[PDB]
Amino acid sequence: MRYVKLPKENTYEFLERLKDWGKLYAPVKISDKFYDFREIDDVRKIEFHYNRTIMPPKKFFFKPREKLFEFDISKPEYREVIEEVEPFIIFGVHACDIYGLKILDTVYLDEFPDKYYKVRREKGIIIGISCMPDEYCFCNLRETDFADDGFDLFFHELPDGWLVRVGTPTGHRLVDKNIKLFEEVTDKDICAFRDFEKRRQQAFKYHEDWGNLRYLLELEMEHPMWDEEADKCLACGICNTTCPTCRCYEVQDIVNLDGVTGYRERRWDSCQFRSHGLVAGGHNFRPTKKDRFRNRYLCKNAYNEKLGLSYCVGCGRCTAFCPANISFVGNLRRILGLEENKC
Amino acid sequence: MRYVKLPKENTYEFLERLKDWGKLYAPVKISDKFYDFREIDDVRKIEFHYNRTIMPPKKFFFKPREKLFEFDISKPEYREVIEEVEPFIIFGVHACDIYGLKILDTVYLDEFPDKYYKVRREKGIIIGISCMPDEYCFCNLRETDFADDGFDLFFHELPDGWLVRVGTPTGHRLVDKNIKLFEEVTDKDICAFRDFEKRRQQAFKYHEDWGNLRYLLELEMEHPMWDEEADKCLACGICNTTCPTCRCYEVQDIVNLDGVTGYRERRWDSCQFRSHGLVAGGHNFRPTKKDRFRNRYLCKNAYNEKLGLSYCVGCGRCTAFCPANISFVGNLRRILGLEENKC
Amino acid sequence: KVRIGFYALTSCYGCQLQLAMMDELLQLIPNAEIVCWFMIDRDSIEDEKVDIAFIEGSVSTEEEVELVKKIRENAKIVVAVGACAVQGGVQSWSEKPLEELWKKVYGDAKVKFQPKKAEPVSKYIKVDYNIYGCPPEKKDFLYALGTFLIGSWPEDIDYPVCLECRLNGHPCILLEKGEPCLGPVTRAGCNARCPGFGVACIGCRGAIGYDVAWFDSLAKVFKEKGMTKEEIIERMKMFNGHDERVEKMVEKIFS
Amino acid sequence: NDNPYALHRVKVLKVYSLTETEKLFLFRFEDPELAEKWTFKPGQFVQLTIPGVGEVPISICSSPMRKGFFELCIRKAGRVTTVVHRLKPGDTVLVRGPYGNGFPVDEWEGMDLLLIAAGLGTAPLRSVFLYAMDNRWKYGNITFINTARYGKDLLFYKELEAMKDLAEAENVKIIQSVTRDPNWPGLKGRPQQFIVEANTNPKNTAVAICGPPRMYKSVFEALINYGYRPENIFVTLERRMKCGIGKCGHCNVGTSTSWKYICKDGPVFTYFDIVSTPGLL
Amino acid sequence: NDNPYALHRVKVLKVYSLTETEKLFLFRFEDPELAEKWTFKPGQFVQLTIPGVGEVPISICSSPMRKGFFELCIRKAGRVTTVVHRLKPGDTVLVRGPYGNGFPVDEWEGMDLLLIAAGLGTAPLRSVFLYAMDNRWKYGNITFINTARYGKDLLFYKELEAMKDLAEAENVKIIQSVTRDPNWPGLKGRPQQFIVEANTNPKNTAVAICGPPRMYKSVFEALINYGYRPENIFVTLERRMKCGIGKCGHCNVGTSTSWKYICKDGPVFTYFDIVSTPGLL
Numbered sequence A, B: 001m002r003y004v005k006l007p008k009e010n011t012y013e014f015l016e017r018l019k020d021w022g023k024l025y026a027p028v029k030i031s032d033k034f035y036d037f038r039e040i041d042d043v044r045k046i047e048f049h050y051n052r053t054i055m056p057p058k059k060f061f062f063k064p065r066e067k068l069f070e071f072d073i074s075k076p077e078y079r080e081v082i083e084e085v086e087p088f089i090i091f092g093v094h095a096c097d098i099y100g101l102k103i104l105d106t107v108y109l110d111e112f113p114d115k116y117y118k119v120r121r122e123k124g125i126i127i128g129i130s131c132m133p134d135e136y137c138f139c140n141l142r143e144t145d146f147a148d149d150g151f152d153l154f155f156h157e158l159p160d161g162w163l164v165r166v167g168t169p170t171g172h173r174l175v176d177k178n179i180k181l182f183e184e185v186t187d188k189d190i191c192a193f194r195d196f197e198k199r200r201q202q203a204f205k206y207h208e209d210w211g212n213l214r215y216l217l218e219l220e221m222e223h224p225m226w227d228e229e230a231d232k233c234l235a236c237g238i239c240n241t242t243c244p245t246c247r248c249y250e251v252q253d254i255v256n257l258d259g260v261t262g263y264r265e266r267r268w269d270s271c272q273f274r275s276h277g278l279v280a281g282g283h284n285f286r287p288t289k290k291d292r293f294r295n296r297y298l299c300k301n302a303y304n305e306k307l308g309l310s311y312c313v314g315c316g317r318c319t320a321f322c323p324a325n326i327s328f329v330g331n332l333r334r335i336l337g338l339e340e341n342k343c
Numbered sequence C: 001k002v003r004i005g006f007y008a009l010t011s012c013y014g015c016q017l018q019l020a021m022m023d024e025l026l027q028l029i030p031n032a033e034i035v036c037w038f039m040i041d042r043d044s045i046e047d048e049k050v051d052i053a054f055i056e057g058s059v060s061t062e063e064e065v066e067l068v069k070k071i072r073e074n075a076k077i078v079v080a081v082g083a084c085a086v087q088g089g090v091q092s093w094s095e096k097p098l099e100e101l102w103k104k105v106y107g108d109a110k111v112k113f114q115p116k117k118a119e120p121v122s123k124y125i126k127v128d129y130n131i132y133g134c135p136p137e138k139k140d141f142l143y144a145l146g147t148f149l150i151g152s153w154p155e156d157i158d159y160p161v162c163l164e165c166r167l168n169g170h171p172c173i174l175l176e177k178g179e180p181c182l183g184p185v186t187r188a189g190c191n192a193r194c195p196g197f198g199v200a201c202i203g204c205r206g207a208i209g210y211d212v213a214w215f216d217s218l219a220k221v222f223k224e225k226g227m228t229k230e231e232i233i234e235r236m237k238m239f240n241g242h243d244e245r246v247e248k249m250v251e252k253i254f255s
Numbered sequence D, E: 001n002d003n004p005y006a007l008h009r010v011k012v013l014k015v016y017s018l019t020e021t022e023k024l025f026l027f028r029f030e031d032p033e034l035a036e037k038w039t040f041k042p043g044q045f046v047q048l049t050i051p052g053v054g055e056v057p058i059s060i061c062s063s064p065m066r067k068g069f070f071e072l073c074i075r076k077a078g079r080v081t082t083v084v085h086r087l088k089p090g091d092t093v094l095v096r097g098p099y100g101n102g103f104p105v106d107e108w109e110g111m112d113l114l115l116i117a118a119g120l121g122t123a124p125l126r127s128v129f130l131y132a133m134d135n136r137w138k139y140g141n142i143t144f145i146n147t148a149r150y151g152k153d154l155l156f157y158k159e160l161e162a163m164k165d166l167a168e169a170e171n172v173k174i175i176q177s178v179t180r181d182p183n184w185p186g187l188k189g190r191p192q193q194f195i196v197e198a199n200t201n202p203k204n205t206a207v208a209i210c211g212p213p214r215m216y217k218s219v220f221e222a223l224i225n226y227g228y229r230p231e232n233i234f235v236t237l238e239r240r241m242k243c244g245i246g247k248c249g250h251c252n253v254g255t256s257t258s259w260k261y262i263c264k265d266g267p268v269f270t271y272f273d274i275v276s277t278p279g280l281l
């Protein structure tokens, strides 16, 4: 891959020339300390250094509220409502978010390729940015700190600019078209990039191995910690609706006033809601609140053999955005015994 | 996965009853401090605790010296020499070796399945043992410390016996046939297993995150450390012939004394040998010794997207069995900067 | 054509007006016939047998009691619309006796008719399906009316307002400023109007049924922000006033 | 074309009122191109879609050799099922393709089969029984045990009792027993009480079980106590499904060690899978 | 059948002494089923095997439409190829199936092609030239530039000069030039300087290059200086090969970031792959 140096006086110029290609989605301020991917109109409002987004970048490919079909009851037919989408450039995707998008690609493009997801994944440019760990981020524990594939551009921050790793095609096209604004890297910036990476690795709050969580979690399925934390839990589904790797959704039918026209709607549904695991006769396969809580923990602590990564990418959205401040990493380390160590 | 406990007074009984299934390949001593996978007849000579084997367990599937075909020039025909192999049970495969076998499965069973490798991988039972890190193992750096799939029985050592994890129907049948010798685990042994795993994690010599070695390796291709270590290198290929994840080999034609009796022989070949990258006209694509040294380092530091693991599993055979005592992890950390700290 | 009747109890007529503010009501005329919508129709028959009865308003009169009993006798499927008809609404917020309220408001004056303490419709007659809200969302009206016209019935919703608050992307009030937002315990369908506009939810659609309304954890997180037990209890029961579960759930966490 | 959620049109040919709470339906796709090529494995389910109501899964209970036709035994226990029950022959319904892996009938050849059905789960076992009967040459003696609990709820009781003489002629022991009907003039006892009288040789027997998982433990214990091979036991379990293509996430079973999904790792499971991960039952 | 190292028997129908250092051969498989069912993509190489000596890779240089026949231009520069050079017509050798990814001819429809061949690499470019000639309707005007260094080293010079008059009537400007020898009565200069005369429109041109990689940098600079699109540039590189199915490990190209293997990731590469992975040249 080619390393192209972008001096800081040309970053906004490159973003303006990037807006020529298509719509730009970058993290902007929405509240006092909340970030979200909003569509860019004025480039100066983009916050380059942001902790995390309130919604993961999966909303562009796995839309939060999507109309699958519109139907007519008479002569029963379902018409798929799919619209052509121009190539959009998602600027400011963390490494953890990039791995989450890869995981959702392995979930949604496997065996049966979802058309709605594929049509939006084939026309998107992911630009990765080197994050800085705050008090919640633990992407090193789940091994999502650095990525090799999935990004067409990687903006690695430098003291005197931005180091751009192209990595993939069409990144070459963008860089070659705007090569007037770009420069060439030498050891001067390489040493600074290495020092920044060393500082980033050293700044993580947690540093321990999590090899045997998937095995030990089954031995301690009936821990009193589950009961206590579930009774502390509010069952609002925020930990899943903001999660980047939750594939679950709920399909509902809406029929108009005429009684002959309607549409089918898809939205994200969490485990905490009652009707996620319900069958006929009022039987629920995770009836109690602790049952659904443990189901979420076990499911996020599963193993994806396609790429060897656990479905949790360590973004920290679940622990940060939980109203009850239930620590995911604290609970999971207490499963290991780093907090109690009774046996 | 079921957890079945084997008390230490029944371990040799289980090995004897396992010899009923087929041939047993266990680590036995060949010299004062060298271990190898020799076919075992008397169970008492098996060393349960051993650092590493001189040859990786790939010799059972990827045989060292294998005859591919026997041919006859008159009426030109190649007859594949494949013999039926009874199901053999490989006892004592460490986690790093298990991941090496998985990597070789990805290499040799992708797109074009190698018949010789597949016929031997189908009829083999892998038994994993929780080894203890000596002053060479760095499996945690490459993330090959705990195995999820590939093994049938996982012998985790316990103070009162051996904890057997079963992850396949073959292992289930094997355990259930001799369930008389087996017991059931409770928290008493689970806590001991937890303590043993904690000690194993804490006993590693190296603990650092090898995140950006692949990218930084290309930036420092011109390092003088390459020249110095290459001039120290002896070019004997021990680091590759003992490596568990080296897929390279050499194909040679041997013709009998008169007319028509040939065999095509396949043997493991290394980068350091001159004729590994030679083309016509005396042109070599890695002519100098440092070129082949760097080629080996870069190739072992490649990325396998099918598994997410670098091809090196961190077994430490290359750094331990090197006669010149050229460190591998030392050189890599010199490139990474944890050993030099210059720029 | 399905025979549909809208019977008005003591209410602000917000539910009927919202049903009138949607332009899709023009398409309901071809597909169904209205027997009792007095605010819209004058020739309405107040005692005709109907198929689906949309009851609006709370029960605060003996005349309303006999009216809702007549509705139950003269209707197959009875639909309670709005918080007033589903859980008593804001008309049942005060726990003081009816005589106390009468003395406070009207003093010693006497009227010919007989008043009554406000109660939900579920206390007198068996309601089958509900359309939650205050006023119910036009989405809910469309959904319930269309499902009834098909020949099936809408399902009870168990997801909180936080679902639409997190889908739309509105910032969380509770995690940011700690205001008393009743999101995690009140059913969705309003598309997070209040947290979208920056005001805390006030239980606009009522507490989640099927015993999946964990008031204890929400009371705990309100207490961690500094609210007193009585303040939290008063913040709840604004629209969930006649819910016997809330007091026990809060006193459990404040035991 | 490439849309995985896409459906196909199918019309109900004949309705058959099976019992009070169940009904049997006959289907044939409107498109001849789909009808001439549609095929399935015994055990795979179909995402039946009523327009404007919802999508529900029903296991196919027909013979795969009969191309262009299949049967769905549906019970009215909820909203979509209540709407389905009102569907008359000669009406339209959207049906999605087969999903999941059926019973391993391809690996089964010649060995004796113990098909033990309990409660509602008779439909996949009815399908495998019809498949085995349509190719009776490549199988040994088979025993089909269908059980219920209210007596009248013996699904396909008339069809089995009509074929009872021919089954006994063809080395087939079909047994129907009730669990909570002492007054019913028939066989009383649990399915475990009747699998002890199985004609199948335990050394060379494959077993298929379906129905409520609360009797799964008892039937497993009874089968393993008689020397039947645990490597040849296969069951079917149901969870909530809304997609059938592995993206809904509702049908999640197992633990962190083995987190199976039924639409892709079933619904036909294995005995060591059942006992390996607790919580499947 | 499933053996990946399996070979097929083939008879050399006719030998043709192309030059002093190269020789052209015509092949046809002995098995009629293999002969009729065989096919390949323009650019895929073949593992020619002399019994008792070894296996060598030679790129196919024939039109894939002509089933059952292919040509291999081989030069004698070592042991196996010296043994090959003594093969008389009608003799039998062993050959393995086509390997690697050929030139993207299927995506090259409707635009002009610039085929620049240097040295030995004319054979795959000859194959794509013949494929384009046999499918002239799918392609626009083409320019086949074949170059050498000693005048007599021009491969297929007689065939190209014979077709030159006819090719000029089909918007085909085939150009031949030498680099070192001035005594040859013909075009002189490096292959780069003759691409300024190319008739292909740079906005809508795909370019294929083959031969020695030392001139690759110069030809890349010349192509990019004339406005030709870098996204439509494809080259061929050779390394040591002994298996062709990804297990030999000898044909490794690139760095740790991009470690390609030619038999699976080529042998036809892309311009951005070449410039983003140093060491390929």
Ligand SMILES: Cc1cc2nc3c(=O)[nH]c(=O)nc-3n(C[C@H](O)[C@H](O)[C@H](O)COP(=O)(O)OP(=O)(O)OC[C@H]3O[C@@H](n4cnc5c(N)ncnc54)[C@H](O)[C@@H]3O)c2cc1C
Residues within 6 Å of the ligand: A278, A279, A280, A281, D045, D054, D055, D056, D057, D058, D059, D060, D073, D074, D075, D077, D078, D079, D080, D081, D082, D120, D123, D124, D237, D238, D239, D240, D241, D242, D267
């Ligand atoms: C693999 C499989 C095979 C089945 N085979 C048969 C069969 O052969 N015969 C038969 O009579 N029934 C069968 N069922 C059960 C049948 O699918 C349910 O009775 C039906 O889905 C009830 O839907 P409902 O809308 O009426 O229930 P509601 O509770 O009103 O709806 C809940 C929704 O959950 C989903 N769901 C998925 N699985 C179930 C389930 N087991 N129970 C309830 N809801 C479920 C549906 O989308 C359903 O609409 C099968 C179920 C599964 C999972």
Ligand SMILES: Cc1cc2nc3c(=O)[nH]c(=O)nc-3n(C[C@H](O)[C@H](O)[C@H](O)COP(=O)(O)OP(=O)(O)OC[C@H]3O[C@@H](n4cnc5c(N)ncnc54)[C@H](O)[C@@H]3O)c2cc1C
Residues within 6 Å of the ligand: B278, B279, B280, B281, E045, E054, E055, E056, E057, E058, E059, E060, E073, E074, E075, E077, E078, E079, E080, E081, E082, E120, E123, E124, E237, E238, E239, E240, E241, E242, E267
């Ligand atoms: C993809 C590809 C396409 C080729 N196409 C042609 C073509 O169209 N025409 C042509 O004349 N030649 C072509 N060659 C070159 C030809 O294959 C070699 O000259 C041949 O392998 C020489 O074998 P040798 O035993 O005489 O060389 P030696 O050096 O004596 O043997 C070394 C061995 O290395 C292997 N090998 C693989 N690639 C090469 C290579 N490039 N050079 C040398 N050995 C190699 C062979 O098994 C060979 O036997 C091609 C090579 C490659 C890799």
Ligand code: SF4
Residues within 6 Å of the ligand: A051, A052, A094, A095, A096, A097, A131, A132, A133, A134, A137, A138, A139, A140, A144, A145, A314, A315, A316
């Ligand atoms: S967890 Fe890591 S990758 Fe994710 S936002 Fe935080 S720093 Fe970035």
Ligand code: SF4
Residues within 6 Å of the ligand: A232, A233, A234, A235, A236, A237, A238, A239, A240, A272, A318, A321, A322, A323, A324, A325, A326
């Ligand atoms: S965000 Fe916290 S309180 Fe809400 S459901 Fe998740 S764990 Fe429970």
Ligand code: SF4
Residues within 6 Å of the ligand: A240, A243, A245, A246, A247, A248, A269, A270, A271, A295, A296, A297, A299, A300, D249, D252
């Ligand atoms: S945690 Fe819950 S919502 Fe998220 S993927 Fe797992 S089952 Fe689905």
Ligand code: SF4
Residues within 6 Å of the ligand: A239, A242, A243, A244, A245, A300, A311, A312, A313, A314, A315, A316, A317, A318, A319, A328
């Ligand atoms: S479980 Fe929590 S930390 Fe893990 S991916 Fe989901 S939101 Fe992020």
Ligand code: SF4
Residues within 6 Å of the ligand: B051, B052, B094, B095, B096, B097, B131, B132, B133, B134, B137, B138, B139, B140, B144, B145, B313, B314, B315, B316
């Ligand atoms: S690297 Fe050492 S400690 Fe790690 S699995 Fe291999 S042998 Fe065991």
Ligand code: SF4
Residues within 6 Å of the ligand: B232, B233, B234, B235, B236, B237, B238, B239, B240, B272, B318, B321, B322, B323, B324, B325, B326
């Ligand atoms: S073992 Fe050591 S001396 Fe021998 S080739 Fe390898 S690095 Fe060189």
Ligand code: SF4
Residues within 6 Å of the ligand: B240, B243, B245, B246, B247, B248, B269, B270, B271, B295, B296, B297, B299, B300, E249, E252
């Ligand atoms: S290090 Fe050398 S011998 Fe080992 S796989 Fe790589 S190229 Fe082959």
Ligand code: SF4
Residues within 6 Å of the ligand: B239, B242, B243, B244, B245, B300, B311, B312, B313, B314, B315, B316, B317, B318, B319, B328
């Ligand atoms: S490179 Fe060395 S440490 Fe890595 S797998 Fe090979 S022998 Fe083991």
Ligand code: SF4
Residues within 6 Å of the ligand: C011, C012, C013, C014, C015, C057, C081, C082, C083, C084, C085, C089, C090, C133, C134, C135, C136
């Ligand atoms: S439910 Fe709400 S909108 Fe309707 S009448 Fe009562 S207070 Fe007004």
Ligand code: SF4
Residues within 6 Å of the ligand: C161, C162, C165, C166, C171, C172, C173, C174, C175, C181, C182, C183, C184, C192, C195, C201
């Ligand atoms: S603002 Fe209110 S409704 Fe929105 S997420 Fe927070 S608690 Fe839920």
Ligand code: SF4
Residues within 6 Å of the ligand: C134, C161, C186, C187, C190, C191, C192, C193, C194, C195, C200, C201, C202, C203, C204, C205
């Ligand atoms: S957010 Fe709460 S108060 Fe506001 S409209 Fe919705 S339910 Fe009513």
Ligand code: FES
Residues within 6 Å of the ligand: D241, D242, D243, D244, D245, D246, D247, D248, D249, D250, D251, D252, D261, D262, D263, D264
């Ligand atoms: S069937 Fe949808 S996720 Fe399993």
Ligand code: FES
Residues within 6 Å of the ligand: E241, E242, E243, E244, E245, E246, E247, E248, E249, E250, E251, E252, E261, E262, E263, E264
């Ligand atoms: S051709 Fe054998 S490894 Fe590439």
